[PDB]
């Protein structure tokens with residue numbers, strides 16, 4: 001229910017997920033300029049080039 | 063003006079790459095975007111900010127094939143793993159377009 | 172004739188041009204001629220072994 005929601009190498013920040021959500025994700029991919037990490041709540045569907053991870057603990061998406 | 067404030071308003075023909083879902087043609091709705099940004103500078107040297115929450119369609123010429131349902135502009139901040147405190151900015155305008163399905167109903171269906 | 176005109180009529184959907192209305196009128200009239208000719212032939216080929 002509590003996840004990390006910061007991006008890339010930004011200082012750490014957290015959020016409270018919606019009631020009934022139990023997960024936390026971590027998307028990583030590279031564009032023309034560099035590497036982007038997207039942390040949030042849930043477990044989404046990603047296109048076939050992204051390194052997606054999902055964890056059902058707490059603050060475990062860093 | 064004498065304070066140095068500059069207002070420049072040039073014309074442009076924009077040709078944007080818009081994905082076209084055709085599942086429901088000729089009764090289809092499209093979401094077309096226009097991503098704008100500074101090419102060689104980052105948000106610490108040249109910052110951009112939208113003028114209004116949504117495009118200006120006060121002098122918009124009605125189409126004949128499309129109806130404007132909604133339009134908005136969103137500004138994004140992007141950070142990369144390499145550079146921890148350098149943001150890359152872009153304003154993205156979207157236009158939700160509904161097609162008028164009379165020509166294709168009378169000519170094909 | 173519809174094919175002939177397919178490349179010369181404006182592609183706008185605020186109204187239908189009178190020429191396309193005329194073509195659809197003639198097309199539906201021909202269709203109904205076909206239907207009623209089928210009906211006439213059906214009546215003509217009836218006999219007591221099949222119909223009273």
Ligand SMILES: *[C@@H]1O[C@H](CO)[C@@H](O[C@@H]2O[C@H](CO)[C@@H](O[C@@H]3O[C@H](CO[C@H]4O[C@H](CO[C@H]5O[C@H](CO)[C@@H](O)[C@H](O)[C@@H]5O[C@H]5O[C@H](CO)[C@@H](O)[C@H](O)[C@@H]5O)[C@@H](O)[C@H](O[C@H]5O[C@H](CO)[C@@H](O)[C@H](O)[C@@H]5O)[C@@H]4O)[C@@H](O)[C@H](O[C@H]4O[C@H](CO)[C@@H](O)[C@H](O)[C@@H]4O[C@H]4O[C@H](CO)[C@@H](O)[C@H](O)[C@@H]4O)[C@@H]3O)[C@H](O)[C@H]2NC(C)=O)[C@H](O)[C@H]1NC(C)=O
Nearest residue numbers: 006007037038039040093095135136137138139140154156
């Ligand atoms: C047609 O197609 C269109 C294009 O595909 C599509 O457009 C999309 O529409 C949706 C809306 O429906 C858009 O989503 C919104 O986007 C907003 C902008 O997002 C960007 O900016 C965010 C803010 O960044 C600032 O703040 C951060 C902290 O909050 C800082 O970390 C940042 O550094 C930055 O700080 C700067 O600004 C601060 C304040 O301005 C200031 O204090 C500070 O000093 C500094 O100056 C970013 O967070 C965001 O990044 C997220 O998303 C990207 C992916 O997009 C991830 O990679 C990132 O990791 C990150 O997670 C963007 O860069 C959002 O603000 C807005 O969010 C709000 O609403 C959502 C709803 O889901 C909430 O989840 C969210 O918490 C926010 O909630 C708050 O506001 C809502 C009301 O708005 C309300 O509930 C309540 O008030 C709440 O507090 C939202 O996500 C989307 O961006 C569009 N995509 C585009 C344009 O590409 C359109 O929908 C389609 N139409 C259809 C299909 O119908």
